[PDB]
Amino acid sequence: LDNGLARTPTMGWLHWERFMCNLDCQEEPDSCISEKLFMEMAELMVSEGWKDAGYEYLCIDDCWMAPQRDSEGRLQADPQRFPHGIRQLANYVHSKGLKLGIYADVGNKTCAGFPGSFGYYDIDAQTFADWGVDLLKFDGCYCDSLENLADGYKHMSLALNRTGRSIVYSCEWPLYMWPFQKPNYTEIRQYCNHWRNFADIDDSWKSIKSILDWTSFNQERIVDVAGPGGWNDPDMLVIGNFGLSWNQQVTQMALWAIMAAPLFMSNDLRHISPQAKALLQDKDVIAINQDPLGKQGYQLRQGDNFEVWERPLSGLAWAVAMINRQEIGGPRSYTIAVASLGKGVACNPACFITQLLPVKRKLGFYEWTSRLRSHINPTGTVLLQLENTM
Amino acid sequence: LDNGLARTPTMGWLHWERFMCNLDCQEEPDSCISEKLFMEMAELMVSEGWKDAGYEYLCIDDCWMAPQRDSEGRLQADPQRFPHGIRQLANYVHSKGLKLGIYADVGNKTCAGFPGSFGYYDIDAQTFADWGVDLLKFDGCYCDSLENLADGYKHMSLALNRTGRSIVYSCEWPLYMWPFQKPNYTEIRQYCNHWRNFADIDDSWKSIKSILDWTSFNQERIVDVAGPGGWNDPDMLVIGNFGLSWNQQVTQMALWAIMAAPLFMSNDLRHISPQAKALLQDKDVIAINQDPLGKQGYQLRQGDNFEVWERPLSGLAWAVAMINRQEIGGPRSYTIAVASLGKGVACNPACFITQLLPVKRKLGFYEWTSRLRSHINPTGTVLLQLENTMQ
Numbered sequence A: 001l002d003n004g005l006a007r008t009p010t011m012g013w014l015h016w017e018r019f020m021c022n023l024d025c026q027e028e029p030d031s032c033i034s035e036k037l038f039m040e041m042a043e044l045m046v047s048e049g050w051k052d053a054g055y056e057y058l059c060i061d062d063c064w065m066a067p068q069r070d071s072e073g074r075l076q077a078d079p080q081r082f083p084h085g086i087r088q089l090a091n092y093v094h095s096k097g098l099k100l101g102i103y104a105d106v107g108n109k110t111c112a113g114f115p116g117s118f119g120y121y122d123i124d125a126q127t128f129a130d131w132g133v134d135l136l137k138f139d140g141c142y143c144d145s146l147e148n149l150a151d152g153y154k155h156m157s158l159a160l161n162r163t164g165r166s167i168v169y170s171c172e173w174p175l176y177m178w179p180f181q182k183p184n185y186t187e188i189r190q191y192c193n194h195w196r197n198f199a200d201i202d203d204s205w206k207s208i209k210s211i212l213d214w215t216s217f218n219q220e221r222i223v224d225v226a227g228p229g230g231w232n233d234p235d236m237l238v239i240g241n242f243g244l245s246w247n248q249q250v251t252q253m254a255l256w257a258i259m260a261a262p263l264f265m266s267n268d269l270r271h272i273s274p275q276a277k278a279l280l281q282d283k284d285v286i287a288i289n290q291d292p293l294g295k296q297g298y299q300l301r302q303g304d305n306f307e308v309w310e311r312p313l314s315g316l317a318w319a320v321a322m323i324n325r326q327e328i329g330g331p332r333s334y335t336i337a338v339a340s341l342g343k344g345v346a347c348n349p350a351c352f353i354t355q356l357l358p359v360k361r362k363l364g365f366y367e368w369t370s371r372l373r374s375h376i377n378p379t380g381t382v383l384l385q386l387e388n389t390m
Numbered sequence B: 001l002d003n004g005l006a007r008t009p010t011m012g013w014l015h016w017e018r019f020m021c022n023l024d025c026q027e028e029p030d031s032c033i034s035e036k037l038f039m040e041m042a043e044l045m046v047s048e049g050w051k052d053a054g055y056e057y058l059c060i061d062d063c064w065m066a067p068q069r070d071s072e073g074r075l076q077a078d079p080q081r082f083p084h085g086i087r088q089l090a091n092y093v094h095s096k097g098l099k100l101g102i103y104a105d106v107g108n109k110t111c112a113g114f115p116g117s118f119g120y121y122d123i124d125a126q127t128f129a130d131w132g133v134d135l136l137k138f139d140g141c142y143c144d145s146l147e148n149l150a151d152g153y154k155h156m157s158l159a160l161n162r163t164g165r166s167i168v169y170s171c172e173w174p175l176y177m178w179p180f181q182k183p184n185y186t187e188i189r190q191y192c193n194h195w196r197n198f199a200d201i202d203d204s205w206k207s208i209k210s211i212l213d214w215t216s217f218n219q220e221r222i223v224d225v226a227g228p229g230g231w232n233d234p235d236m237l238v239i240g241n242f243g244l245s246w247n248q249q250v251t252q253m254a255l256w257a258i259m260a261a262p263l264f265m266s267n268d269l270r271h272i273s274p275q276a277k278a279l280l281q282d283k284d285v286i287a288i289n290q291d292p293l294g295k296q297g298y299q300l301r302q303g304d305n306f307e308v309w310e311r312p313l314s315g316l317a318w319a320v321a322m323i324n325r326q327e328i329g330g331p332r333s334y335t336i337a338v339a340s341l342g343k344g345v346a347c348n349p350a351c352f353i354t355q356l357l358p359v360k361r362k363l364g365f366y367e368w369t370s371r372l373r374s375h376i377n378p379t380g381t382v383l384l385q386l387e388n389t390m391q
C-alpha cells in the first residue's frame, strides 16, 4: 500500500490475545475491554520505555463496539465501557505522543458478533478518520462470497485514502481466502500495509511452530512481495505472558525480526517480568526488524531438527537465526560454513559476527574459509549479525 | 514390593532426559555420559541443598556400558568414559551420603544397543550388588514375547533379593506390556518398587499434558494400587531445562506431588535458574509428595478447560490442585464449594487453607458451607493445602 506509511514494520500493542472479548466489567473491571484499560497501557507505554523502543500504535481489537449503530448508521463505542467515545480516547493517546488503532470487519458482523462494515465502507472510513484513528485492523468474518471479500477490502482501502488522513491499513484478506483459492499478494500489497496470512496465535509453543512452519513452507510465494509499505503479518507477539519458556520467547523475538514482521505485543504491561521487558525492548534486535531496506528473511536450510534462517540488511549486513526444534536433551551443537551464509557475500573475504540472542556477545572475525559453531537450547534460537569486513 | 524400601516416593536425579545417550566425550565433554558428570552432579547435590531436600539417589540411565561383556560374562562400564569403574564411583557417591542407581534391560540389548540382561539376570544382579548399587532401573526394550517380559521382570526382582542388598527396583514392565494386553498391577506391585506407565517425557508442555491426560483417564485402574513400597511412575521431572514456561513448571511440580510420584530430576544442576531450584526444593510441596499415608491423588472434576485434582494426606489434610488448560487470554476465575473438596471431610466443620503454588499465601479459615475462590494462570496450577480444624 502506497500511502507513505509502514515504511518499516508497524510496532505497537494489540489487546486481543491477552484480553480477548472480556465484557465482565463488574467482576473483572481491570481486565475487561474498556476505555480504562487502554488508558493504562498508554501511560505505561510512555513511562516504561515502550514508546522510546518503537512501540507507537496502541490498537483496539474486536469488542469495542456498541451492539448497534446509532440512528445515523454510524458505528458506536460501547456507552458503558467507552463512555467518553473513541475520538476522546484518540485525543488522549495523541497527547502522550502515541497513535490509535481500531478494529472493524469486511463482513456483516465482526467475529464476536458486533456490527460489520459491509454496506457501510465509506461512512465507517470517514467515521474512523473523524475520530482521529491512525490504524485499522480489518477482519474477514461473516463474508459469504470470495468476491465480496476482495471487493470489500479494496473498497475500504480506497475509502480510507479519500478521507485524507494517514491510516495504517491492516488486512486479514489472504487468511480468509487461502482455504478457497491462492491469494494474489501483488494485488493484496496494492491495497494493504500488512496482511494476516495464518491462523490466530495463542499463548503456546505449538502456535509459534505452526506459524514458522507455514511461513517457511510458503516462502517462495510471500517473501519477495514484502517490503516498505507492505508486510507479511504472522500475528502478535505473545512474549511476557504464560505459555512460553524463556527460550521460546527468544525464538519468537528473533524470528519475527528475521521475518520483517509487524511487532504487535499482546500482553499486560502492568504485569510483565524484567526479563520479558528487556527482550521486547532489545534495541539491536528491534533494529534488525526495523531495517530500512525492508527485505524479509527466509529459511536457508532445515535438517537434523535444526533450522537456519537469514535476512539481508542494509549496508551489506546479514542477520542469521539458528533454531533447535528438538524438544529433548540439552543444548545441541550446530555448525555451518560461513561461505554458505548471505548467498556467499556476507563473509567474503571476511566478516565480524556478533551474537545478539540469547545474550549479546562478540564472536569475532570469521574468514571466508571459516565455520560458525554454536550451541542452541531446545526450542531456543541463536541470533547473529554479520558485518562484512569491507 | 516390600523389601522395606520406597516407603515414600523415591527422590533423586536421573540423567536421561537432559543428557540421553551422548557418547561423544571428545567434542561434547560436558554433555557426554561419563563418571566425571556424575561425580560433579554428586558434589552439587550436596553443596546446593538437594540432598537436604530429599534428593538422595544419583542414578545412571542407559549408555554406561562397554559394548560387550568381559571374559567372565559380566557387564562392564565403558573403559574410556568410566575408566575408574562403577565400584569406585559408588564409593565416591556414598562418601557424600548419596545413593547410586544404575540401568539394565530385560531383553538382550538395552534400548541404546548395549548389552542386555536376558540370560544373565542373576549374574547381573549380583554384579550390581558387588558394585554397591542401591537402585536399579529396569528397561524393556528388545523383548519378544509377553512371557519373557513378565518372567524377566519377576526373575530380576528375585535375583536382586537373593543378593541380600537393599536395592530399589524400578520397572518399566507395564509400559512395555500395554501393546499386548493391559497390565495386572497387583502382580506388578508384588515385584516392583515403582513402575513406568506411559511413554517417555520430554522437555515440552505437550508431554506433560499428555502424561496428565492418560493418568486421569486410567486413574480408576492405577490409583488405588499405589502405596508405600509401590508407586506409579509418570517419568522424570524436567523442571530447570528449556521447554516449560514458569507456570508449566509449577504444574508439573504440583501434579507430581498430587500423584505421589517418584521425583527424579532430569536437568543440569550445574546450570539451573534460582527460580527452578526453589520450586524443586519447595519443602511444603515435597512434603505433600512424601506424605506418610502414601495415598495417590486423583482428578476430581474436569470441564471448561479446567481441571481439579486432590490428594488425601495424613491427619485429615488434603492437597488440592486446580489447572487451567486454556492456552489463550489471561488468569481465569474458578470457584468451588469447599464441601466438595476432600470428599466433604476436609473442611468439616472447618479447615485452614494455605496456598502453596504459585506463591505461598495463607488464605484463612473456611467453614463447611463456604466457597473457595481462586484465579489460575493459563497452563498454570494453583496448589492448596487444606488442614481440617475446629473453628
Ligand SMILES: *[C@@H]1O[C@H](CO)[C@@H](O[C@@H]2O[C@H](CO)[C@@H](O)[C@H](O)[C@H]2NC(C)=O)[C@H](O)[C@H]1NC(C)=O
Binding pocket: A002, A003, A004, A160, A161, A162, A163, A164, A165, A166, A167
Ligand atoms: C492515497 O494514495 C496515493 C497513491 O495512490 C498516495 O500518494 C503517494 O504518496 C507517497 C508519499 O506520500 C508518494 O511517495 C507517492 O508518489 C504518492 N503516489 C501518487 C500516485 O501520488 C497518498 O499518500 C494516499 N493518501 C493517503 C491519505 O493515504
Ligand SMILES: *[C@@H]1O[C@H](CO)[C@@H](O[C@@H]2O[C@H](CO)[C@@H](O)[C@H](O)[C@H]2NC(C)=O)[C@H](O)[C@H]1NC(C)=O
Binding pocket: B002, B003, B004, B160, B161, B162, B163, B164, B165, B166, B167
Ligand atoms: C526379600 O523378600 C522378602 C520377602 O518379602 C523380604 O522380607 C520382608 O521384609 C520386610 C521389611 O524388611 C518385612 O516387613 C517383611 O515381613 C518381610 N517378609 C518376609 C516374608 O520375611 C526381604 O526384606 C527381601 N530382601 C531383600 C534384600 O530385598
Ligand SMILES: OC[C@@H]1[C@H](O)[C@H](O)[C@@H](O)CN1C(=S)Nc1ccc(F)cc1
Binding pocket: A016, A061, A062, A110, A111, A112, A139, A175, A176, A198, A199, A200
Ligand atoms: O475477532 C477475530 C479474531 C480476533 O478477534 C482477532 O481480531 C484476530 O487476531 C483474528 N481473529 C480470527 S477469528 N482469525 C481467524 C480467521 C480465520 C481462521 F480460519 C482462523 C483465525
Ligand SMILES: OC[C@@H]1[C@H](O)[C@H](O)[C@@H](O)CN1C(=S)Nc1ccc(F)cc1
Binding pocket: B016, B061, B062, B110, B111, B112, B139, B175, B176, B198, B199, B200
Ligand atoms: O533407552 C530407553 C529410554 C530411556 O533411555 C530410559 O531408559 C527410559 O526413560 C525409557 N526409555 C524408553 S525408549 N521408553 C519407552 C518410551 C515409549 C515406549 F513406547 C516404550 C518405551
Ligand SMILES: *[C@@H]1O[C@H](CO)[C@@H](O)[C@H](O)[C@H]1NC(C)=O
Binding pocket: A106, A107, A108, A118, A142, A143, A144, A145, A148, A149
Ligand atoms: C450480508 O447479508 C446479506 C443478507 O443475508 C447478504 O445478502 C450479503 O451477501 C451479506 N454480505 C456479505 C459480505 O456476506
Ligand SMILES: *[C@@H]1O[C@H](CO)[C@@H](O)[C@H](O)[C@H]1NC(C)=O
Binding pocket: A184, A185, A186, A187, A188, A190
Ligand atoms: C496479480 O497482481 C496484479 C494485481 O491486480 C495483477 O495485475 C496481476 O495480473 C495478477 N497476476 C495474476 C497471475 O493473477
Ligand SMILES: *[C@@H]1O[C@H](CO)[C@@H](O)[C@H](O)[C@H]1NC(C)=O
Binding pocket: B106, B107, B108, B118, B142, B143, B144, B145, B148
Ligand atoms: C535373546 O537372545 C536369544 C538368542 O539369540 C533369543 O532367543 C531371544 O529372543 C532374545 N531376546 C529376548 C529374550 O528378548
Ligand SMILES: *[C@@H]1O[C@H](CO)[C@@H](O)[C@H](O)[C@H]1NC(C)=O
Binding pocket: B184, B185, B186, B187
Ligand atoms: C492379577 O493379580 C494376581 C497376580 O499374580 C493374580 O493372581 C490375579 O489372579 C490377577 N487378577 C486377575 C483378575 O486376573
